[PDB]
């Protein structure tokens, strides 16, 4: 079977500026070739087909080229709507194949995080288990480190992180850092801090808060 | 104004069958075949039938997995999927040849895992925190199968939300969810976050109050 190889997972571009996502195939699929969009949750959107042919309602800043083996869908101008997972596939033969996506990234002026800290709620402290919640929201650009720190040492056991995907609106990344402790070990130390570093400050980016206020 | 409806995410125990859905409509339904499609957080081709002749064909990876049929009557495709593993689970896609009309898509957990409802934590800044700005939170732990869906006051608070993708351990799923609302308005007013986790057919309100 045929193996459609899209080499870049993501690809970086400015709003109306143009980018070009590529893809490969194993073996000659002629011009069988379509250029699918997806959004989180929602199902694909047929942009291109046999190639270079806009399919109906796509904007005309889609162009679609290649023949053979190398194929390229191109975005002219691009939108804040475009941001989205790119897909080619072959339907030269049987069993239609894709490739494995390109995903979209919008770049933006840079943006600092804004970080909040939250003790474990007296609710969780009931059935023993205790985590301690930061959010660090809104930032750009994505790459960003976080340490927790209990009474000025770092932990990273218990710690689970989470990320949105980018922002359709204003093009900046949200994170989620949660430490869960159980209750004794949570009322055995004091200060909880989560600190981040992250290009916008030479300087880490502290919030904490003292248990035994 | 083709419309193609799915079936709803179903959680099934390894070793059974599922039989998903697709109804059409808008359109001759013998006059267009219907494809179905595999995604796995990428994605695969299954098959497709043709109502109007009969003709089925099936990707030979899913030829002892998959079998589709079409109902005429009803306008309705379906794709039966039996010995599931837990490698099934997916979103399943059906789609109109040729023309960009999909199902919403179906999620399908294989698991032997037990359907657990949500505990909803309130998370309040700490009583020494503190400026025009403030940002609250909800804890969501401990369900299983995904989803849940949160809002915030009901959807009234829609800007300043940032619900974070959930993460697995010991067949629980937890995330949290912040939005972040002018000092004006809270504690002076209700700040609530509400949590639906469909497959255990509740939804709880949990208040975040001053701690
Ligand atoms: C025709 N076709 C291959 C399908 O319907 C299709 C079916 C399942 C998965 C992807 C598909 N791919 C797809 O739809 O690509 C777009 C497309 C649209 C029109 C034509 C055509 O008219 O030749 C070809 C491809």
């Known amino acids: 079977d045929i193996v459609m190889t899209q080499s870049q997972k993501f690809m970086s571009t400015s709003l109306g500026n143009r980018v070009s996502v590529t893809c490969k195939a194993s073996?000659?699929?002629?011009?069988?070739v379509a250029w699918f969009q997806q959004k989180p949750g929602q199902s694909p959107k047929t942009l291109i087909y046999?190639?270079?042919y806009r399919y109906s309602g796509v904007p005309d800043r889609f162009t679609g080229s290649g023949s053979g083996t190398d194929f390229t869908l191109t975005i002219n101008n691009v939108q804040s709507e475009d941001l989205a997972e790119y897909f080619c596939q072959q339907y030269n033969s049987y069993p239609y194949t894709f490739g494995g996506g390109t995903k979209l990234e919008i770049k933006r002026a840079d943006a600092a995080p804004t970080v909040s800290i939250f003790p474990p709620s007296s609710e969780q402290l009931t059935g023993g288990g205790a985590s301690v919640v930061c959010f660090l929201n809104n930032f750009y650009p994505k790459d960003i480190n976080v340490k927790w720190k209990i009474d000025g040492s770092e932990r990273q056991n218990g710690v689970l992180n989470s990320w949105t995907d980018q922002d359709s609106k204003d093009s900046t990344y949200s994170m989620s850092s949660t430490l869960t402790l159980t209750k004794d070990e949570y009322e055995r130390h004091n200060s909880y801090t989560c600190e981040a570093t992250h290009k916008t400050s030479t300087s880490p980016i502290v919030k904490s808060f003292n248990r035994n206020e | 104004q083709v419309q193609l409806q799915q079936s709803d995410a179903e959680l099934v125990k390894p070793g059974a069958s599922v039989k998903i859905s697709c109804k059409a409509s808008?359109?001759?339904?013998?006059?267009?075949?219907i494809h179905w499609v595999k995604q796995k957080p990428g994605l695969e081709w299954i098959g497709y039938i043709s109502p109007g002749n009969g003709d089925i064909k099936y990707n030979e990876k899913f030829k002892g997995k998959a079998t589709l049929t079409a109902d005429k009557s009803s306008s309705t495709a379906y794709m039966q999927l039996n010995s599931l593993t837990s490698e099934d689970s997916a979103v399943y896609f059906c789609?109109?040849?040729?023309?960009?009309?999909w199902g919403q898509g179906t999620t399908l957990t294989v698991s032997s895992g037990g359907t657990t409802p949500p505990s909803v934590y309130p998370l309040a800044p700490g009583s020494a925190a503190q400026t025009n700005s403030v940002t609250l939170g909800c804890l969501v732990k401990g369900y299983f199968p995904e989803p849940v869906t949160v809002t915030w006051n009901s959807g009234s608070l829609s800007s300043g939300v940032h619900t974070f993708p959930a993460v697995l351990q010991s067949d629980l799923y937890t995330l949290s969810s912040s939005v972040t609302v002018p000092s004006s308005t809270w504690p002076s007013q209700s700040v609530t976050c509400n949590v639906a986790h469909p497959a255990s057919s509740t939804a709880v309100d949990k208040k975040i109050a001053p701690a």
């Open positions: 789609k109109m040849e040729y023309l960009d009309y």
């Open positions: 046999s190639a270079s």
């Open positions: 073996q000659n699929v002629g011009t069988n």
């Open positions: 808008g359109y001759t339904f013998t006059d267009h075949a």
